[PDB]
Write a protein that binds this ligand. Sequence first.
Ligand SMILES: [Mg+2]
Ligand SMILES: [Mg+2]
Ligand SMILES: [Mg+2]
Ligand SMILES: [Mg+2]
Ligand SMILES: [Mg+2]
Ligand SMILES: [Mg+2]
Ligand SMILES: [Mg+2]
Length: 201
Amino acid sequence: LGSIRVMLIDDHPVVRAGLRSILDSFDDITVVAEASDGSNINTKGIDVVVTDIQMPGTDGITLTRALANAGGPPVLILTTYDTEADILAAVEAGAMGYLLKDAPESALHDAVVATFEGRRTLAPEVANALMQRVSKPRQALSAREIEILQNLEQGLSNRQLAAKLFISEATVKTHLVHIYSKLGVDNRTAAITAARQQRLI
Ligand SMILES: [Mg+2]
Ligand SMILES: [Mg+2]
Ligand SMILES: [Mg+2]
Ligand SMILES: [Mg+2]
Ligand SMILES: [Mg+2]
Ligand SMILES: [Mg+2]
Ligand SMILES: [Mg+2]
């Protein structure tokens, strides 16, 4: 056949229509099927699946894995640089290709062809979006949190901490949750050890 037969999947018909128009505009690509999620999909006659991440029912991450399990057609995942979707889970799913939805049209064409030919598209723009999303610098422990650790080191219970610092036992407990998360621990003895190793107190 002269054209690569695409199934285009997106829960947002206003966005889907723009992508369809772009894909169909190439002489070597034809959108033969559309869907609004990844459920019940029949891939007979489909050369490439082009899919969104965020969709109700079966999302693009689950669809990617399902098609992989079936030995189904290869998948190109489209997203946005500022997506609220789980971009890390999408990348971990191991689709053949990844591209942003507002990439140059030629790049979308080339991504479809690459996907069809079984060549990976790990688009730098997607990689950059992933790094931005997952690499979040975390704030220092606050003065209050350091104070709590210094008193935990002296062996104070939650009640004693509350009495000494003039904050409620519930407020103490909330702080401890946050401290334990920052320290990578789940109890008070381990927190003290970590705070000592980390030279925090
Ligand atoms: Mg969408
Ligand atoms: Mg056009
Ligand atoms: Mg066409
Ligand atoms: Mg095929
Ligand atoms: Mg453009
Ligand atoms: Mg070209
Ligand atoms: Mg000290």
